[PDB]
A paper describes a structure:
The pentameric ligand-gated ion channels (pLGICs) constitute a large family of ionotropic neurotransmitter receptors that are ubiquitously expressed in the animal kingdom. The proteins act as gated ion channels that are closed in their resting state and that open a selective ion conduction pore upon the binding of a ligand to a site located on an extracellular domain. ELIC is activated by a set of primary amines that include alkylamines, aminothiols, aminoalcohols, bromoamines, diamines, and the neurotransmitter GABA. ELIC is a cation selective channel that is essentially impermeable for anions.
In cation selective pLGICs, three layers of hydrophobic side-chains provide an overall apolar character to the extracellular half of the pore region while the following two layers of polar residues and a layer of negatively charged residues render the intracellular half hydrophilic. In a recent study, it was suggested that interactions between aromatic residues (i.e., Phe246) of the outer hydrophobic layer would stabilize the closed conformation of ELIC. To investigate the role of this aromatic group for channel opening, we have mutated it to alanine and studied the mutant by X-ray crystallography and electrophysiology. The structure of the mutant F246A was determined at 3.3 Å resolution and shows a conformation that is, apart from the side chain truncation, virtually identical to WT. In electrophysiological recordings we found that the EC50 of cysteamine activation of F246A was shifted towards higher concentrations. This shift is due to a mutation of a residue located remote from the ligand binding site and thus likely reflects a decreased efficacy of the channel. Our results thus do not provide any evidence that the ring of phenylalanine residues, which is unique to ELIC, would stabilize the pore in an unusual non-conducting conformation. A previous hypothesis that the observed conformation would be induced by strong interactions of aromatic phenylalanine residues at the extracellular pore entry, however, could not be substantiated since the mutation to alanine did not change the overall structure and instead stabilized the closed state of the channel as indicated by a decrease in the potency of the agonist. This observation is unexpected, as hydrophobic interactions generally play an important role in the stabilization of protein structures. While the bulky Phe246 and Leu239 at the extracellular half of the pore of ELIC would result in a smaller pore diameter, the constricting intracellular diameter, which might be the main determinant for the conductance, could be larger.
Residue numbers in the entry:
A (entry chain A), B (entry chain E), C (entry chain D), D (entry chain C), E (entry chain B): 11 to 316
Amino acid sequence: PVDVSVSIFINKIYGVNTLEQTYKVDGYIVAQWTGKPRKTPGDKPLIVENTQIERWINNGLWVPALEFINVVGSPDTGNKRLMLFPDGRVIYNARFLGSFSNDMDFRLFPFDRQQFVLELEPFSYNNQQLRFSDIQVYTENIDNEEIDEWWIRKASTHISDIRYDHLSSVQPNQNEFSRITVRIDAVRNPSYYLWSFILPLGLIIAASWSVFWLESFSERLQTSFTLMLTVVAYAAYTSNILPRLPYTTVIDQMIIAGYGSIFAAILLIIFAHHRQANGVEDDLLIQRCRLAFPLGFLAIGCVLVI
Amino acid sequence: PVDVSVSIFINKIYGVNTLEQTYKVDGYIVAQWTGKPRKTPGDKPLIVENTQIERWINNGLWVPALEFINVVGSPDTGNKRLMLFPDGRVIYNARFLGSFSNDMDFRLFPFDRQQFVLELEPFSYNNQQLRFSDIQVYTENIDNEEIDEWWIRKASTHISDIRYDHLSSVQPNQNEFSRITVRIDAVRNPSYYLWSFILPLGLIIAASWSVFWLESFSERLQTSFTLMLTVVAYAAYTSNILPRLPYTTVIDQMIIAGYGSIFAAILLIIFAHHRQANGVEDDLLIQRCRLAFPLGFLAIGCVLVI
Amino acid sequence: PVDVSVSIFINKIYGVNTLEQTYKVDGYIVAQWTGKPRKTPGDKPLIVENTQIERWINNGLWVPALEFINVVGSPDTGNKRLMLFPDGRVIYNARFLGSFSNDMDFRLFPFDRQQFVLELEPFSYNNQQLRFSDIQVYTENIDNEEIDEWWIRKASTHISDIRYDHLSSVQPNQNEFSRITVRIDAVRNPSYYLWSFILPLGLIIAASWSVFWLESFSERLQTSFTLMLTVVAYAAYTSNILPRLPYTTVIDQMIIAGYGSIFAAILLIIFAHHRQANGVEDDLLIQRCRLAFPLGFLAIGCVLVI
Amino acid sequence: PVDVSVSIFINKIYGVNTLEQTYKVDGYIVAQWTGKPRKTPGDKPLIVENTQIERWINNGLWVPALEFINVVGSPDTGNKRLMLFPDGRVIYNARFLGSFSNDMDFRLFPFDRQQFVLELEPFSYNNQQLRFSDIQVYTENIDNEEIDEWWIRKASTHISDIRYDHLSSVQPNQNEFSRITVRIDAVRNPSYYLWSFILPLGLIIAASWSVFWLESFSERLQTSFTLMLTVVAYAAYTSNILPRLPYTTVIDQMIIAGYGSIFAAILLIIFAHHRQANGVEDDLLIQRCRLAFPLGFLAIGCVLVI
Amino acid sequence: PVDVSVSIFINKIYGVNTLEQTYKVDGYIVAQWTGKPRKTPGDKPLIVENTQIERWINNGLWVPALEFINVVGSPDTGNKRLMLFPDGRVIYNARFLGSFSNDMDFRLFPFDRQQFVLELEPFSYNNQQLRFSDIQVYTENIDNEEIDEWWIRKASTHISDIRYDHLSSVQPNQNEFSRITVRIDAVRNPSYYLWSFILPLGLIIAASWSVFWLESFSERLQTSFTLMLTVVAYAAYTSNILPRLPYTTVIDQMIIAGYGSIFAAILLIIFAHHRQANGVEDDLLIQRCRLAFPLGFLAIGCVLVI
């Protein structure tokens, strides 16, 4: 059972694709294992670069294919490098850029709690064990977090053994491969969305209610039709700029709320008026519920967060 | 007639392209067949990885080219692997990611009933039979379906023989290739569209009718012009965010309905008024059809679903 | 002069790019010609697949490069295959996906009459004649045309000889290559555009005129400003969803019409009023031209289609 | 100093990228030079196609690398072809598709005067002279110009010598490479923009002024607020469909003009009214400047074109 | 310690991707170092072009892999070229196009101060020193800056030594690689954004205030609802055309300001009216604060720039 030591260097995690639950990772992979001692020119280790590596394979030099279990597509491999030591051991170092997959929940969108994952595992080797895994998130935590879209925490390794129940016609015990699993926790940067979506959406819902401080009945009603048109004009601006998803986010709900608030008002206003015993006996208290549901909406809103 | 045993491992079905009727599939293919026993170093099976396989072909080792009948483009092949057994048999294993085609009907868009298909078939072999086909949809049915865009059911195999009537100048019987056909049934997740499109669209159509609870004639009419402008502002928001298609979906019809409801009203309102024997004799009952077509629209709507 | 027999199998014609006059074609190409008889292992034809073909070339086996005259870019080649017969003849079969060009006129957009073309021609061979060309449009005419964007008719071949006047320093007669030209005629599916663009645009133009059935002068005018705003809100929805072009379509003109109809009304309304001999002597007949240009617009519209 | 004769065949110039000042060019390149006579099989010229050319290089056959100085990226090379003559001379022919750069000024957008350029130049050869350059714009001038976005004129060659002041540690005179420069002049097709942007934008500015033919003061003012909202609704439609740039076009200015015209009116209207010696003494002439700046706007507009 | 002399020729810096903090760079790289003198055919330097270089490597000729530390992906390499001198020294010249990364702050968007950076560094060599670095920004400073999106200043080099604390199991001192760092300072072109966003946004905020010069109370309020709808209609036009970011820009704030100004007015107007001791005693001074916050907004605005 060959012992391999992997070292992943994360350089940048970007381009999150909300719909496909994808994110790009740029970094380097380093694998080290020991082989039958070799005669290296001079004596100091031999450095084999790109094109050359493929040659050394054709001459027996074995090199284990380490797959990225959770990769969408196939990584963009940069510079490959083989460092051959005289005492046997071999060190493989290559830079990569790939798109990884993982279960991502964007229900609370504006305030996300996501976690980026890598999953290494020998493509075709039952007894080729992954010794120790080390990840260098040499990125800067409290650096300039208000410049980048996501804020992080700290790395997280975890080696394990995966058992497949439908392999080759093998029975003895060939069905356990060692898988390195890296995890990075990150939180989304609320800022932008608060000051450009939540806030103004609120001022719209607020000024929405000021339709009650209108005297006439026609004014009270005809104005909420211009108010309806405003929430639609907003849902457009919101949608054209927000990430498409299969489910509704928080913001998606604030928009529904704005739709109900205005439909509620429409009902009250066309109720207050025709709920009479004459013709214009608008219930002085209902027509003056200018403070009834404006705060009664912070009660329906503080129950959806409970 | 060589016997081949295929095994498809579906890992993720994503990126559905409504307009081109495309969808992406990530997984592995495993093909097994038996050949003339061989002398493998040691004795335990020989493992040939990437670069190497192409070499073994140049030395006679045959490997059937298995085409993906319904693939748009050419699959993104990851790690290839040849496992050569001493008793002959050969096992080919490779990871792939490709875009597949299939007839997709999106008439009832918000509520779709689609089915993802794969179609394997030897690219150039008449008598090379596909033995047994197995698919491991090791994805989780009732897991977190309210996180993913589509909900599934269960795999579905089916081997068969395809007959081409215009092949080489061959007559005997060379015109029957065996094709593996995999089918996966899936249903779209209505949620999002209901709570962010259907609902608010209804509140717009509802409050649309409240144009009748207006006293004056000018108010009753001039307001439906702001109401018209509202449905348009909605069709914009809807279109910019929904999947472009060559035909109309359900939502596309609700939008037409909102257009007709407002045009109907426009006709009634400019009828009730000028349908007099004086000048302002607005038919007290028609001007008060505030409950005539609001429910008479649930009759025109429940006949389109019949 | 080598005789070559081509057979094109169109599998799907999609992704029309209005602006670049591009369209994608997926299918297979089959070329057959006869060479100096060969000794094939066994005796039955020899099958050379992908990688291998490039090898047989290096050993003399000649294979003519057949260019796709009208291809934007370079086709996405799938599986290549050489079938070598003992009696000489060679059969080349490969699957392709490319983007083709052609002059496309989208003037009557909603109702297009386009034609998809392919153009094969030996890249570097003067006397290498293309024998017979056959195209298998094994797609289904009256199948589910109301599911696909385009409706077709039937294939259409045509071999010819092209003469270039500026080739190599050759004089004898080297300047005539044989070009296969395939043509497929198609018509666009009006549906969607009628029920989602033409119709509602008409209800807007119709209800546009009902600005005359208003009593006051201020109402008659101030209302047409909200009517103007409506046609603009529509041109936005239309444009964001329709295909960008360098010229105006039919729909683009109906939009101009709605702009003139409203500007015409603006003139009449601000004429009828101030065309007096007092101050409010609104020409009873002009102010009541509620049926003058509404049908007088079907006369200006039925002359643009003449 | 090797004499090379180049021949560029422009097939289609499309996809202009306003922001990056890019445009795509499809065509063929033909380079001819004479070498040490060779023994060609048979005697008639030898035809070397794709894969093969790379082989002949490995056997000494030299082939000058001709770079495309102004190419963004790297051309999409199609079919390559080497025609080797017995008398020495070699003819290189290959089809290409690349993205080229050039300084493009879109200040007068609707009416552009641009020029597409190509720039060939030996990548690594001081004394390898480019003999004669010929371009076949075998496209059709007055053909169907009202179908294509751009209208042309006629080709334009020009060979020259470029001097680099910072090359290798060479002094003698190695610093002059011959560069072929092709230029094609083209004009944009105004049509669409006039009938779908300029015209309707004018009818909006025109009907804008008719806010003066209103009696009351409140009507005269409150209506220009719906007029303001209209120009904005237009800038949206315009922007979403027009090409993003770093500077303002003509249309971009007409939109500013419409903004000023309405702000001007806002000032006059709120001046005429409060510029009294009572309360409602609206200067009969100013309130009746219904023809003052409507034509006084054709004076401010005919000075921006002077 | 091999001495290498690099020379970077920047040809064009374009395609800034605000969200990913990326920018494209086209140019050539030139690396020179001296090796063991060689016998070159003739005597004058040997020119090795593309395909060939890979060959000379297989025959020992070493070529250091120089990585682009801050590259997203992997550069698009054009023509490679090896110039081998008899006296040893080797000169590597290749054209590239890659996407580079760097921290970019777009807080003051309309007026940006950004800096484009390149970072070279030997991929696998501890003692391979980079001698002198030279960059030829042979672009034209005060040329046509009002045609390009960005304005520059002047190049800026800087060689240094980077120390990695987690390399191979090496202790002596193998952990210091030499890195070339190029920096180019650039400023964004405000123009467009001023005349198409800032200006018209101001005329909207300006004319926003003229809601005070309205007599009635209903007019003063109902008009600000059409004014609100106007700022939203603007945020839409702005957003669809501006670069998506995770934070708010200057323009994003002017939009918030217009939202507050109108919400402020809404409060005042619904205060002035109901802040009585009767019913319509609108505080003659407050209702006439037509000059209170219009200039009192230039005070809140000149404190956000302080």
